[PDB]
């Protein structure tokens, strides 16, 4: 574990991360996809191998030893707000579960659903939420990465909130 576990927030491309793994947004069907998925594939297409998986999990490939954990958000296009709001929530845990599970003392992780799978809705407080409520048992050091200007002010309003 990390010696104080912490989040931080950077505004940057998560496949530039200084952490021991990397939490990718990706589809169901391990396609190099778009947005963070793209960059993902990219950087670690070797972690591409059998990355499928259904929505509400996580399945962890690895690139080299560097793990890649493809965690499948919903896209709120397609669910209602009451199930895809469940499905997100199951994600991040399987996330935790994964970070627990390969000992790690930190991780780069994206706000799941809340790019081209929000269903054009702001989720930045209902994704970094569940992020929490999954990511706040384990003890590794967690760098959220995220690329709009704002969203940084408010990603990091609301972890300093909680210090
Ligand atoms: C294509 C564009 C990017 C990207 C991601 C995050 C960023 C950024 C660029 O500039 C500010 O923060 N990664 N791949
Ligand atoms: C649309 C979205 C992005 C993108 C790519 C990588 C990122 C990211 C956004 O936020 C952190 O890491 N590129 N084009
Ligand atoms: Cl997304
Ligand atoms: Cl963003």
Redesign the pocket.
């Known amino acids: 574990g990390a010696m104080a576990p912490s989040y931080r927030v950077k505004r ?4 530039k991360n200084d952490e021991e793994c990397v939490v990718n947004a990706a589809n169901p069907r391990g396609l190099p996809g ?3 998925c ?2 993902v594939y990219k950087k670690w297409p070797e972690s591409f191998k059998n990355s499928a998986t259904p929505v509400g999990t996580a399945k962890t490939v690895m690139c080299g030893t560097y793990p890649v954990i493809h965690a499948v958000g919903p896209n709120f296009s397609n669910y209602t707000e009451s199930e895809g709001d469940r499905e997100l929530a199951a994600a991040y845990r399987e996330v935790a579960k994964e970070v627990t599970r390969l000992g790690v003392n930190s991780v780069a992780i ?1 706000l799941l659903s809340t ?1 081209v799978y929000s269903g054009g809705k702001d989720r930045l407080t209902q994704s970094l939420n569940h992020l929490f409520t999954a990511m706040d048992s384990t003890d590794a050091d967690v760098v959220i ?3 709009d200007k704002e969203w940084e002010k408010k990603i990091s309003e609301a972890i300093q909130m909680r210090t």
Request: hydrophobic share 35%; proline share 7%.
């Open positions: 940057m491309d998560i496949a778009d947005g963070v793209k960059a994206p790019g990465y995220c690329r």
